[PDB]
Design a protein around this nucleic acid. Structure first.
Ligand SMILES: [K+]
Ligand SMILES: [K+]
Ligand SMILES: [Mg+2]
Ligand SMILES: [Mg+2]
Ligand SMILES: [Mg+2]
Ligand SMILES: [Mg+2]
Ligand SMILES: [Mg+2]
Ligand SMILES: [Mg+2]
Ligand SMILES: [Mg+2]
Ligand SMILES: [Mg+2]
Ligand SMILES: [Mg+2]
Ligand SMILES: [Mg+2]
Ligand SMILES: [Mg+2]
Ligand SMILES: [Mg+2]
Ligand SMILES: [Mg+2]
Ligand SMILES: [Mg+2]
Ligand SMILES: [Mg+2]
Lengths: 127, 182, 51, 72, 141
RNA sequence: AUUAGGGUUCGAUUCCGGAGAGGGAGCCUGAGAAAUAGCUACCACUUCUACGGAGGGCAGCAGGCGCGCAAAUUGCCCAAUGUCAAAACAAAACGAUGAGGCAGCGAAAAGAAAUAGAGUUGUCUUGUCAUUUCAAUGGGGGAUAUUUAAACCCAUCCAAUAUCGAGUAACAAUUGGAGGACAAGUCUGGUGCCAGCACCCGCGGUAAUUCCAGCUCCAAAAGCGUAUAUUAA
């Protein structure tokens, strides 16, 4: 055992270009032998941005990372959109919330249900 | 409700609960292979009974029967791949001669002990459950892991283990922390 | 007559269980039994003489 | 089937006799089914005659077949 | 001797059907007379109220006073005799206590030297009688 | 389910089919209903009222009350699977959905799997006993974090400059048994046909292989008894 700085390497598989949704689809697996814990998604996003030479790191969407039993590996799914505008248009709201730019949470669904059921008794401007 | 995840049992209890010959024989196996409970032996018993039941059905069929050819080939392939039968014996009749020690010798606990990585079968058991044994660079913590012949040469200490190429274990680390405080 | 219910159990002198070191559990216990029975007419609980 | 009764008007009852196999006892039973069949006046079947019947639309409460051929 | 003909299935079916009623276990399993006579009504257990503590003498050659209680079932208001199954456990029982009663192991048949007793007490006041006997739980109230 | 084979038995319950929406009837609209979170009437039950009057249908989901031997949260969400629909997603601009999914509870059942491992010296080759020394690991505490709709589990880690922890490892395994069937005591106290055990045969009336206890031993083991059905026997 020799102490050394923990360095992660990014490998992609099952790569596909999805021109319908203006993005690239692939499976990303990370080898982190001496990493203490789990590799945060932000670091993997930066390394994928450097690897694929996409101009902006925020164009990369990552999710569903599973750490392999025993350590040293982590496999997830990645998306690289053609531009940031395309990522904001096509990504689901919860993934955009993880990346930072997401819609504010809606009010509790029970409150909406109760308001809707009260209005069904009303009629006109009162509703 | 509306969950379709199948599951099945893997062992059965013996018909006669108190048979001194069976109790002594099972006590021998438990001590010899370091087994936790009789359920591990009975799990091996069901595996053997299913294999022999399949073999007896196939051996009934004519030797040129397509089902016998396909499934007989698969059964022999499985026995050879997992080391139950040696490569010398290739007939379907040799599957019927398999015994409980044949399967138990293929457990990772026995293989680790026989390989010299452990001093005893009990040392092998705790080594496996403590994430020290790796098969093809993959840490295996299951003692009942049946080792294939191909994977037998790839068994060694885990790279993340203190006995392999990993950091120091708990007692050394705690002692170092105490020394730093002291 | 229902009056003598529990007569013997109440008559029995109370003796507390002795404090003893714990036995091993699980696999280690079977190792102990294997070492006692083997690697060492057979009587498993042969007792001292009495009358 | 075989003609069983010709008592109705332009209608006959035929009987289809068959063997039903009981799996447990590996043996057969004799069973029969009776059908009401419309008989055209083109035929004059008698009891015991064998006829060929074809399926048609419901012509009455019980009639679903028509006599197509009579074999003495 | 029996029929053996190739087309003699109906005879064999009728013969077996007629002779199955000779089997007491089969007849009981396919007739409601035992179910209607069963105080539990086909249930594994039943809950009842203790009416009276009684002493049932053991049958010869045994000689003892088997401590039993008279129980009226909640479901159908039928009276049964149930045995209290341990040493001194009759003191855990009181009149008007709610007890859980089970079978005695022989499926409606009297068990042991106890005359015509086919039930035993397993819980009293919603706590296991054997747990009280071993002092693993305390009698409520 | 059980099963050499033949059979025996279960199927309210996820999929398909049918039927019902307290009990009956009748009907409108509509392509399709004899619809019930549609209407009409009667019966039973029942709610509000200012007494003139007006309502209700959980065998949907949660929840109650009863009934019973007997069966969870008045939770979160539409992220996935679908359905409907004027509807792709986005942009002041987020469709509904107790279908469904996710968590809570849950020893029905199923899978894996801890409760220690290596020696040291001495004592009574192996094997016991004492002590005595090394490592190792989880249970658990946490995190740059990961997961997830969000959380929670599971996985990863205890430095990557830099990260908590076993010795009585008190982090202490139980459930039944020890005459026979049936594996395991001709042990020691107590009781004395009593108390009690005992599925059956039987034990107990002063020296109990069977009760109540203690010790020791046996079987299965995170499981083990009991009752009732059922299959084999
Ligand atoms: K949805
Ligand atoms: K004695
Ligand atoms: Mg059904
Ligand atoms: Mg019913
Ligand atoms: Mg249901
Ligand atoms: Mg309907
Ligand atoms: Mg209706
Ligand atoms: Mg409703
Ligand atoms: Mg109505
Ligand atoms: Mg409900
Ligand atoms: Mg229950
Ligand atoms: Mg639902
Ligand atoms: Mg932990
Ligand atoms: Mg989950
Ligand atoms: Mg014996
Ligand atoms: Mg004595
Ligand atoms: Mg468990």
């Amino acid at each position: 055992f020799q102490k050394k700085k923990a360095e992660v390497c990014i490998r992609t598989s099952q790569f596909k270009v999805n021109k319908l949704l203006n993005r690239k689809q692939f499976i990303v697996e990370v080898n982190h032998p001496h990493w203490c814990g789990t590799v945060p998604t932000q670091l993997i996003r930066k390394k994928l941005a450097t690897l694929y030479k996409v101009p902006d790191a925020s164009q990369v969407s990552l999710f569903g990372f599973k750490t392999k039993f025993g350590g040293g590996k982590t496999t997830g799914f990645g998306l690289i959109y053609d531009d940031l505008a395309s990522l904001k248009r096509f990504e689901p709201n919860y993934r955009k919330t993880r990346m930072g730019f997401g819609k504010a949470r809606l009010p509790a669904r029970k409150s909406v249900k109760e308001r809707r059921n009260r209005n069904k008794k009303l009629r006109g401007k009162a509703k | 409700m509306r969950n379709y995840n199948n599951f099945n049992r893997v062992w059965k209890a013996p018909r006669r609960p108190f048979e001194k010959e069976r109790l002594d024989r099972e006590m021998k196996l438990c001590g010899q292979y370091g087994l936790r409970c009789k359920r591990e032996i009975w799990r091996v018993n069901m595996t053997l009974s299913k294999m022999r039941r399949t073999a007896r059905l196939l051996l009934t069929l004519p030797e040129n029967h397509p089902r016998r050819l396909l499934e007989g080939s698969a059964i022999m392939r499985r026995c050879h791949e997992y080391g139950f039968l040696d490569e010398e014996k290739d007939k379907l009749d040799y599957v019927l001669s398999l015994t409980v020690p044949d399967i138990l010798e293929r457990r990772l606990q026995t293989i680790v002990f026989k390989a010299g990585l452990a001093k005893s079968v009990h040392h092998a058991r705790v080594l496996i459950q403590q994430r020290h044994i790796a098969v093809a660079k993959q840490i295996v913590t299951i003692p009942s892991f049946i080792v294939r012949v191909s994977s037998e040469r790839h068994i060694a200490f885990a790279d993340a283990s203190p006995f392999g190429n990993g950091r120091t274990g708990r007692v050394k680390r705690v002692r170092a922390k105490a020394a730093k405080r002291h | 007559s229902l009056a003598r219910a529990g007569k013997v159990k109440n008559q029995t002198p109370k003796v507390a269980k002795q404090e003893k070191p714990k036995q091993p559990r699980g696999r280690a216990l079977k190792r102990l039994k294997y070492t006692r029975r083997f690697l060492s007419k057979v009587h498993m609980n042969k007792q001292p003489p009495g009358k | 089937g075989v003609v069983h009764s010709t008592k109705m008007h332009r209608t006959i009852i035929i009987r289809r006799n068959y063997l039903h196999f009981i799996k447990k006892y590996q043996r057969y039973q004799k069973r029969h089914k009776s059908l009401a069949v419309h008989c055209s006046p083109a035929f004059d079947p008698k009891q015991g005659d064998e006829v060929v019947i074809g399926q048609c639309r419901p012509l009455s409460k019980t009639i679903r077949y028509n006599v197509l051929e009579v074999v003495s | 001797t029996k029929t053996n003909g190739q087309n003699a299935a109906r005879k064999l079916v009728r013969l077996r059907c007629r002779n199955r009623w000779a089997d007491k276990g089969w007849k009981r399993a396919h007739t409601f007379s035992a179910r209607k006579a069963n105080p539990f009504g086909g249930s594994s257990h039943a809950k009842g109220i203790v009416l009276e503590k009684i002493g049932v003498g053991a049958k010869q050659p045994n000689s003892a006073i088997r401590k039993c209680v008279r129980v009226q079932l909640i479901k159908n208001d039928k009276k049964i005799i149930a045995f209290v199954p341990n040493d001194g456990c009759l003191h855990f029982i009181e009149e008007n206590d709610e007890v859980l009663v089970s079978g005695f192991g022989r499926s409606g048949h009297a068990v042991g030297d106890i005359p015509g007793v086919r039930f035993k007490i397993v819980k009293v006041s919603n706590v296991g009688l054997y747990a009280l006997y071993r002092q693993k739980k305390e009698k409520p109230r």
